[PDB]
Each structure stands twice: as C-alpha cells, then as structure tokens.
C-alpha cells in the first residue's frame, strides 16, 4: 500500500481516481485498472485508476462521493493498491437512502441506476454509498450485497436489484 494525499477531482466520474503517470508506473498500474482504496474508520473502496497530468506524485484526485465513502476530506491520506482479482458481477443489490427518496420516486432502475451503470463497468464494493443525479434529483444508494462478495464490476450481464426498504442515514 502506497499512501497518498487526497486531492480534488477534475474528472467528476464517481468511479474514477487519478494519479500522476510516474506514480502509476511506480505502482505498476495501467490505465483502467481496478484499485483498492483504504480510508478512515476502516473504510474501503474500489475504483478505476486513470492518469492526470497535473496530479502531484504523492497525491490522488478523487471526487466527493469517493471521499465520503472513505470518510476522508481533502488533505487526508489514503492507501492504494492494485485489485486485479475483481470479477464481473452476477448480481448486485442496492437500496436508496431514505432521506433522498422521501415521497414519490420514479423507477430507480430506469431513472437512476441504468443510466449510471450502463457501459461504465463500475467497480463497486458492499457497503459503498454512491450518488446518482436523475435531473435534478440526486439519489444516494447503498450497496447492500454483491455477488461475488464483497466486490465486483457491474457489467452487461450483471443483474441489478433495487427492491426493498430504504436505508436510514448514518
């Protein structure tokens, strides 16, 4: 695990973190590889690594969603490592966060999850919280299960389940 200081994202895709090319080379990471991230409070996340030409060697660019998921702020430190084992998921189960789906919400798959996931090959982990903007509503979801467990890539054959009671915040 290489340690890196958390910096702001330029690429706003939730699945993406960015490193300098020299840091990618040092870690033997290739553009598009899955990486495992460790943050505070024993939190983990899986992301896709890309290079960024303005990124300092000792830093990682990550968006607010990934920061929140790792319980880190700008300027905090995370660890990174390659996560090459991650397979295509058979199925995943995600549930919305109650306070983002109070009152009437359209079908979560159609409005949020399908556009979010479609052709993105997003790595996800059990326990992640992610945010989808469905114009102009933002719904947050929690990953309650993956198969395989506890992480997978959400691919064309992956079956996405989102039925159940909304999750309570905190």
């Amino acid at each position: 695990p290489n340690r890196l200081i958390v910096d702001e994202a330029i690429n706003e895709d939730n699945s993406v973190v960015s490193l300098s090319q020299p840091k990618m080379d040092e870690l033997q990471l290739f553009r598009g590889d899955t990486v495992l991230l460790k943050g505070k409070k024993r939190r983990e996340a899986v992301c896709i690594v890309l290079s960024d030409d303005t990124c300092s060697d000792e830093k990682i660019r990550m968006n607010r969603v990934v920061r929140n998921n790792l319980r880190v702020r700008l300027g905090d430190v995370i660890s990174i490592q390659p996560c090459p084992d991650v397979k295509y998921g058979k199925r995943i189960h995600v549930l919305p966060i109650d306070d983002t789906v109070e009152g009437i919400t359209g079908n979560l798959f159609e409005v949020y999850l399908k556009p979010y996931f479609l052709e993105a090959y997003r790595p996800i982990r059990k326990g992640d919280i992610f945010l989808v903007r469905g114009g102009m509503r933002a719904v947050e979801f929690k990953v309650v299960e993956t198969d395989p467990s506890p992480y997978c890539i959400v691919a064309p054959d992956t079956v996405i389940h989102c039925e159940g009671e909304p999750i309570k915040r905190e």
Binding site: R91, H93, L118, V144, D157, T158, I160, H161, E163
Partner: peptide, 12 residues
C-alpha cells in the same frame, strides 16, 4: 438472511 428480490440485467 438476505432478501435479494427481483432485478434487471443491465445490458450494453
């Protein structure tokens, strides 16, 4: 244990 319910195949 866990209730998966029913789901949608993402597709491409």
């Amino acid at each position: 244990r866990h209730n998966w319910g029913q789901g949608f195949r993402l597709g491409d």
